[PDB]
Amino acid sequence: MKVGIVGSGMVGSATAYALALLGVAREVVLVDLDRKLAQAHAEDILHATPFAHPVWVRAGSYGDLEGARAVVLAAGVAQRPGETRLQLLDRNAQVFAQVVPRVLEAAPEAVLLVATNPVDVMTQVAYRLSALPPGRVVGSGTILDTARFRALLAEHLRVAPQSVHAYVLGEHGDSEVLVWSSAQVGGVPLLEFAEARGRALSPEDRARIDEGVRRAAYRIIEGKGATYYGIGAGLARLVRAILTDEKGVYTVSAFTPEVEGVLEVSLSLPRILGAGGVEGTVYPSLSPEEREALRRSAEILKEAAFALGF
Amino acid sequence: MKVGIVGSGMVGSATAYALALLGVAREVVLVDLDRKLAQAHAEDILHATPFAHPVWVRAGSYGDLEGARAVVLAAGVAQRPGETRLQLLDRNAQVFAQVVPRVLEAAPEAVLLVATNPVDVMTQVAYRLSALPPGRVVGSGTILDTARFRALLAEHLRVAPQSVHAYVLGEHGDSEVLVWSSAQVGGVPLLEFAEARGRALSPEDRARIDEGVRRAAYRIIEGKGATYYGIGAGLARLVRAILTDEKGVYTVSAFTPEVEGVLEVSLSLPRILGAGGVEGTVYPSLSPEEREALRRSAEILKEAAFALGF
Amino acid sequence: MKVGIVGSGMVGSATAYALALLGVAREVVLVDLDRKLAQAHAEDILHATPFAHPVWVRAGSYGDLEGARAVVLAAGVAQRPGETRLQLLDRNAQVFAQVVPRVLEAAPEAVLLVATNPVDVMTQVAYRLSALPPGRVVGSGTILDTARFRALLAEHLRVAPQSVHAYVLGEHGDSEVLVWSSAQVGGVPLLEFAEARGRALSPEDRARIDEGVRRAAYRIIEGKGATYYGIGAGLARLVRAILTDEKGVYTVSAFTPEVEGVLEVSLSLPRILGAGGVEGTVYPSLSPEEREALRRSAEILKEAAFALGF
Amino acid sequence: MKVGIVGSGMVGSATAYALALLGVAREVVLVDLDRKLAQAHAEDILHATPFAHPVWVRAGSYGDLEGARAVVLAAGVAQRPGETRLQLLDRNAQVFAQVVPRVLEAAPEAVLLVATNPVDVMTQVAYRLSALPPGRVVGSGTILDTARFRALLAEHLRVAPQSVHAYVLGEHGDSEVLVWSSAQVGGVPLLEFAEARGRALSPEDRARIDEGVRRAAYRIIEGKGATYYGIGAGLARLVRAILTDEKGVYTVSAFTPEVEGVLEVSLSLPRILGAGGVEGTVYPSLSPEEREALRRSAEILKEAAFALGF
């Protein structure tokens, strides 16, 4: 099987690295405007393969994406001093108007996995331009925020992250919704589990954890300039779910007909991931405060998309 | 690291095979009264290692368990031509009186993982004889039952079993409790999830599944004569959690001070598993019906233990 | 991807178990005349999946094999007391004459992996009946003998088997050829490495090791009746190489146009294994003594396949 | 188990990333003068864990290395504009003079794995300053050059790199030695194997491959600015060999008493890797030209180390 990655920057390359180390696919193709950049990352990653799994890693053109079961869109415009959030959005939408049709021309049957930020709006753009069934276009969404939420809770509880069933929904950003209400561990309410563990989650602890998730990216960027290991692994995990027709449940972004009264908007909800991309959407147990948060998050994304024309 | 397995029958050897294939430990030692048997299994598994991971698989004596972080107790007696079950229960308790002291004498710090049936009572016996803290003695318990419940639900919902958070508690027997009330998928009640999945769980479906779990072993024995693959993988999973100090949550058996009223009895509950064995016990959200069922199970188990004198 | 296994005995089930534990394929189908048996094993293995990877394990008929990229042929051998060598052969050959066309009818593109013994003769038989290119029909051959040679050398040298580059060629039987002449570790001749390691291989050690390989199966059977863990892993590994189009080198059996003179004979040689089965065959450096022993090995097999009618 | 990494740049972080994704150790500690850099990388990697294996990833000080079984030394100062490699070497040696004692103060029994370049010289420095047994100080050496040699050959032959038994010895640099003489695939000499595969290695192909290996870093740097994925996977693989007491053979750098008549020099040769670091060294079959090449490489490295006072 083959996986394509358009945009060979830190995110696209870290993603290829994860796919290689975990042996998700026999072939990985990197495509970038800067051909020398993609070739360098590709050789660097190919050299890692003898230590792990045989994988044909190479740089290429859109045409080289032929036959790919999934293509990760991690292409973005370089940020500069004095660039509002909207200015970025417009520029990246221009990038996608070029990339999407070019990718689909070479790999018409590929599932598109959107990473470019703002991921929810870009997922909407990809969806509109692709003219494919809604589920064929998936955005990473809050899959990384959910991981962050689980990792911070795990550190507080001294339990493996994978045993912490907590979710983050809505916008991958400021208005995201941490679903404390139905969070559970071992089949019991999170707060109740924490107490039993002797590591109760006080209101102070919860506010601190909220900040940790919400300000996660900002803090990482402050220390190293950009984030990429976390998303790289999240993208690789989603790619594997797709290539293996896993039918696993993840909080990812996709075109949603209606959510809390907001129509035609892309945001994250728990969904079933398989060979055709998203093949099922679930609407979880939300408290009133959470439903309110979700509505607001959806309206924010709806207006951002609308202003752009999608 | 080293893992020991006392009792090289189908269960014990199947566990060793899974451990080797997954490369959980650098060394696996098999010990059995029938040395030819243990040696045959050890060589057969050793021959599989070049296809998987480097593991020194070998047969030996109790002294060869020295240094083992975990030792699986899968040693039991063969049923006689015209004997009952309580007959075996006493016979096996005598095996443990020989095995336990000999094990802890060679590996004083090892965590004991009990597989021998009846697993719950055998766990309490191991507990009494070991003179180690409660958590150091763990029984497979309903770990396999929980696995069957998720597998059956997975087939019905067409989702990965790992995405189905449903548990089976109590006795690893007919009095086990299927926790339907708190079962969830994607943070949604099981029934509601099945609904939105277009694969609703009718009263009949639930009844058919409930029976598929309870009669699982019976059905397999009818066609195979015994079960080993399922439990072998479960035991290997638990050994891995222990060696890596995972801190993962599983439904396993352990000496419990108080459960739904009953006192000092070994039964399954969701517990945190790590280097010291079980290091935390929690009680899931149960319905009135399930509570009563769990109490009955505990009472039933308490009575059985007392009778043997443990 | 789907993998099929015909014959749910100990070999067939152990192979399925390894495939499940390693998550090689999303679906594994067991097919066996003894329907209850295949169902018992399928169920036992399915229950292990929640501990490893999501795999749809089930029992079924030939039609359920459609889409399978690889089908393991492990059915036959059911010798009667007093029954002759050839007599048993004819009975197996007949089984194959019925199984092969039915499997290829359901999955025409599937690669055939033969396990039934005598594997070399049964591989030639499946080859003639299949009407497919020579590489589409692969036999386990000396895959296990090679693993045994490495394992025993590994124990003597105290190094990982994967670092011992030694092979066993020819027939998977008494005529097998242990290639001592060109065996190497770290790019150094075996004997020269052994000495540098402070663990020289005396003529006594070699004879002993040679005996440990040749009598491997015999010794295991004395202890537990039959072998299956070693071959189960080997088969699972070859299936993985095929499903992932690995292009890895293994000593397996396949119809061979010419071997040291003998024409049209099936036996083991280092071959490149990929999605189309074997796609390359080479002859390692052999010493006069090894080359001659291989020729006689090819002769025996040649005569054996003829007498049978293939 | 715990692994420490001093130097949280791209190499150090990429290494921690591979370790986390592969679940090599339960705990990974990143130590860096730039505290915010190490914290940001640690959080970014911690966030990837829910998608793979539970690993406590964190930034810390030397005291946090306590109990570490292995500590990767990837520390180095940023090169100044116009500064030469030799001038940079002096500064990095001073860093080691400070780093080595601190590491050993906190983790006296740890194996030190050197990554900072020039790796052979820095390994010699680490060795002299450490005062530990020779095998306890290991340098990545030519592990990556060997990987590159195999990757390039694999692409030419269209076979898995792990099936290509070729090595690169001596200096991790311009004088490195490509051991063409004893390189083999399937027990067959490399050139002979290439012919059979129908992809012969012409003099021109061999020269191109030599340049491909020798100029690999240079070529990646001109496109990416630096290399890190390849070495990150190689370092992680070595760490794993150490923690599991693998006893695997790899081409790595370590203090060598005598090589081609050159005394007390650090360079790469095939070695056995286990819990104590390197526990055995062997000398591969070398042609006259390779021996000459190795001698020159060894002389270049001894002079280089001697100039620093090591």
Ligand SMILES: NC(=O)c1ccc[n+]([C@@H]2O[C@H](COP(=O)([O-])OP(=O)(O)OC[C@H]3O[C@@H](n4cnc5c(N)ncnc54)[C@H](O)[C@@H]3O)[C@@H](O)[C@H]2O)c1
């Ligand atoms: N979804 C998440 O959780 C998440 C996490 C981290 C980063 N991101 C986002 O992913 C994007 C990329 O980040 P990055 O750090 O890798 O940045 P870079 O490191 O800026 O990566 C962008 C690359 O895309 C390439 N590119 C632009 N147009 C292209 C085109 N038309 N065709 C092919 N390649 C093209 C560029 O040349 C550049 O190398 C950003 O929008 C970033 O904000 C998302």
Ligand SMILES: NC(=O)c1ccc[n+]([C@@H]2O[C@H](COP(=O)([O-])OP(=O)(O)OC[C@H]3O[C@@H](n4cnc5c(N)ncnc54)[C@H](O)[C@@H]3O)[C@@H](O)[C@H]2O)c1
């Ligand atoms: N926990 C579960 O869910 C589960 C699942 C399947 C089987 N089991 C149980 O595991 C046990 C073993 O099953 P099995 O199929 O391997 O049976 P066998 O095939 O009956 O295995 C028992 C082995 O223990 C050995 N033994 C007895 N005393 C010993 C001693 N003192 N020292 C060393 N070895 C000793 C015996 O020689 C025998 O080979 C049974 O009690 C079975 O009911 C439990």
Ligand SMILES: NC(=O)c1ccc[n+]([C@@H]2O[C@H](COP(=O)([O-])OP(=O)(O)OC[C@H]3O[C@@H](n4cnc5c(N)ncnc54)[C@H](O)[C@@H]3O)[C@@H](O)[C@H]2O)c1
């Ligand atoms: N082993 C190999 O084959 C190989 C391959 C590629 C790069 N490298 C080498 O690894 C080194 C690092 O490369 P990099 O790309 O990560 O560079 P960076 O990205 O330059 O990494 C160096 C980091 O170490 C930190 N540091 C310096 N002194 C320290 C000290 N005294 N204590 C704690 N931390 C300290 C610095 O703050 C810096 O962030 C270089 O010497 C590079 O040449 C080796």
Ligand SMILES: O=P(O)(O)OC[C@H]1O[C@](O)(COP(=O)(O)O)[C@@H](O)[C@@H]1O
């Ligand atoms: O804790 P449980 O109920 O045994 O579930 C464990 C399973 O949960 C998972 O973390 C998935 O959880 P989610 O479905 O909430 O995302 C798996 O990775 C893991 O195998």
Ligand SMILES: O=P(O)(O)OC[C@H]1O[C@](O)(COP(=O)(O)O)[C@@H](O)[C@@H]1O
């Ligand atoms: O010891 P080397 O030369 O680094 O080769 C190591 C590789 O050898 C293998 O054991 C394969 O050896 P073979 O090609 O002889 O079968 C791989 O599993 C392993 O990755």
